[PDB]
Each structure stands twice: as structure tokens, then as C-alpha cells.
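Researcher: Predict the fold of heat-stable enterotoxin B.
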Amino acid sequence: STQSNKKDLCEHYRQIAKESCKKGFLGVRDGTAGACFGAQIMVAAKGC
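Model: C-alpha cells for heat-stable enterotoxin B follow.
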């Protein structure tokens, strides 16, 4: 409904929000810890 061609690339961007979350929590993304949601948001003002 909302996305079809803008799929996986934009999801892939939240796939990067995974490797935010497995390793480290005091300089991930310089917020500090994107941690599988503070990079899921950042997608909506980075490329997607």
C-alpha cells in the first residue's frame, strides 16, 4: 500500500539499523546507541 518500488534499499537502511544493535553502545552513530530504533528513525531523514 504505502511502499512497493521504494522497498529493500529503505528496509536495507533499517538492515543497517541491525549492525547498530549487535555491536557497541557508546559510539555507534554519534547520537551514542542507535540500537535498532535510533537508526530506524534516522532512515526517514538520511535517504528514505
